[PDB]
Amino acid sequence: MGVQPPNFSWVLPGRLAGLALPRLPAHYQFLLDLGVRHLVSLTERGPPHSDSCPGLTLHRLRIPDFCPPAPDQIDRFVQIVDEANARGEAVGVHCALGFGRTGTMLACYLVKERGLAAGDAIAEIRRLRPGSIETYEQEKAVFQFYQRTK
């Protein structure tokens, strides 16, 4: 039995989801039940109770709140999703609220998945998850990822 964590939704159904901070054993069980085997954690302090769920692998990429992921972090995130999805495993990504840091990562993955530029990728994540991508530097990070990988 799982309990859906806060602000959870699929971006790529069965492949890639965003969420706010998970914090109960049943949140992690929910992720496992939905086929998630990897949780990319962007917070400065690990989410509560993750150690109750050994079957879920956490990948901690620390990003200060209201700041963008760095290029190495974007590349690592993209690798984690590509490799997990190729193994038939889904990935979740979270921050404290699930909007800024999380939305920026999700938009970068769409740049790659759909061959989009940042305007389209950011628009799409905002359509799916209104409130996503909170700062100017977060927007610029998606743009620069596009430029590096075009």
Structural domain containing residue 56? 1-150
- Picking from 69, 30, 26, the residue whose alpha carbon sits closest to that of residue 48 is 26
Method of determination?
X-ray
CB-hemisphere CA count at 13 Å for 4?
A: 7
Structure tokens at 134: 């909170």
Q: CA of 141: how far to CAs of 9, 33, 39, 81, 101, in Å?
A: 22, 32, 21, 19, 11
Structure tokens at 30: 């929910």
- Told to judge if 95 belongs to the known catalytic residues of this protein, a careful annotator would answer yes
Domain count, the chain: 1
**Active site residue: 53, 67, 95, 108, which one?**
95
**3-state SS string for 97-118:** CCCHHHHHHHHHHHHHHHCCCH
Distance of alpha carbon 30 from alpha carbon 23, whole angstroms: 12
Resolution in A: 1.1
**CATH number, residue 105:** 3.90.190.10
Q: How many CB atoms neighbour CB 16 within 10 A? A: 23
- Picking from 103, 92, 90, the residue whose alpha carbon sits closest to that of residue 134 is 103
Q: Is 21 helix (H, G, I), strand (E, B) or coil?
A: coil
